[PDB]
């Protein structure tokens, strides 16, 4: 598991990738095709919240659901 202490041990310029590395497989389970885009969207969130989402499945799911609805709305807006 990724912890606050582990994340702080990393070079600051690496911290988002450490999060993305752990977030992606879970998001890909939920959304196999679009996981890469969704992970990119969530990585904009603050690291503390991302750490919480990594260890709370309900929290991750609800943010992923939001990301998907925003992506779909944007698809209609670009159309």
């Amino acid at each position: 598991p990724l912890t606050a202490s582990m994340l702080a041990s990393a070079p600051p310029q690496e911290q988002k990738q450490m999060l993305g590395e752990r977030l992606f497989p879970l998001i890909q389970a939920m959304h196999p095709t679009l996981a890469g885009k969704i992970t990119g969207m969530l990585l904009e969130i603050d690291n503390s919240e991302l750490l919480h989402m990594l260890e709370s499945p309900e929290s991750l799911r609800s943010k992923v659901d939001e990301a998907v609805a925003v992506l779909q709305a944007h698809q209609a807006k670009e159309a």
Binding site: T39, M41, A73
Partner: peptide
């Protein structure tokens, strides 16, 4: 949430 975000590529 920003739908223009850069796509993640996993290692």
């Amino acid at each position: 949430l920003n739908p223009n975000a850069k796509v993640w590529q996993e290692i």
